[PDB]
């Protein structure tokens, strides 16, 4: 589990606002979901190369044209999308 | 700066593979970026409602209808996407 005091400390490096305990909890939940799915994808990537060790190369950025299709296809898998993932995407789309 | 040891410990709850230091560092970079943009978007939602406190409601999901539209429009914005956001989106579109 991630330490809530550390997450809130980092949050307050990006805002002067007060931050509720429930808000910190929700970010921690999203962060844990991110750790989970990145690690699972990284393992799948190490497997494709026959490795049993996750390396930096297993966290990938697809070239812009493939990632553009992959996002467009994702736009139509929202109805069964985990809440934590919808929240992440809401943040990413609200920020850009 | 999240503690890299505890992030790797969370990773190992989801994979049996070894994990290199550089992989842990990469994920930590992603997590720090997520903390930043989630807090920045949260503050904006707090402001829109006249508050100076980030609450759980500011880490939000709209509808599956508005989210679907923003994910479509996100697909046309790869060029302004920082690498860390691209890696997050690659993970999300590779996983589930």
Residue numbers in the entry:
A (entry chain A), B (entry chain B): 1 to 96
The authors write:
Archaeal histones are dimeric and assemble on DNA into ‘hypernucleosome’ particles of varying sizes with each dimer wrapping 30 bp of DNA. Here, we characterise the structure and function of the histone paralogue MJ1647 from Methanocaldococcus jannaschii that has a unique C-terminal extension enabling homotetramerisation. Unlike canonical histones, MJ1647 tetramers can bridge two DNA molecules in vitro. To the best of our knowledge, MJ1647 is the first histone shown to have DNA bridging properties, which has important implications for genome structure and gene expression in archaea.
To elucidate the role of the MJ1647 tetramerisation module in oligomerisation and DNA binding, we solved the molecular structure of the MJ1647 histone by crystallisation and X-ray diffraction at 1.9 Å resolution. MJ1647 crystallised as dimers and the refined model shows that each monomer contains the classic histone fold (three α-helices separated by two loops) with a very strong correspondence to well-characterised archaeal histones such as HMfB, including the electrostatic surface charge distribution. Unlike the disordered tails of eukaryotic histones, the MJ1647 tetramerisation module forms a well-structured region of the protein and is composed of two α-helices separated by a loop. The two helices from each monomer are packed against each other to create an interleaved or ‘hand-shake’ arrangement, adding considerably to the overall interaction surface between monomers in the dimer. The dimers in the crystal structure differ to the tetrameric state of the protein in solution observed in SEC-MALS and native mass spectrometry experiments. This discrepancy is possibly due to the low pH (4.6) in the crystallisation buffer that could favour MJ1647 dimers. Unable to obtain crystals of the MJ1647 tetramer at higher pH, we generated structural models for MJ1647 tetramers using the structure prediction algorithm AlphaFold2. While TM helices 4 and 5 form monomer–monomer interactions within MJ1647 dimers in the crystal structure, TM helices 4 and 5 ‘open up’ in the tetrameric model and make new interactions with opposing monomers that enable dimer–dimer interactions within the tetramer. By comparison, the distance between positions 80 and 95 of monomers within the dimer of the crystal structure (11.1 Å) is incompatible with disulfide bond formation. Overall, our crystallisation results suggest that MJ1647 might exist in an alternative state next to the dominant tetrameric state we observed in our biochemical assays.
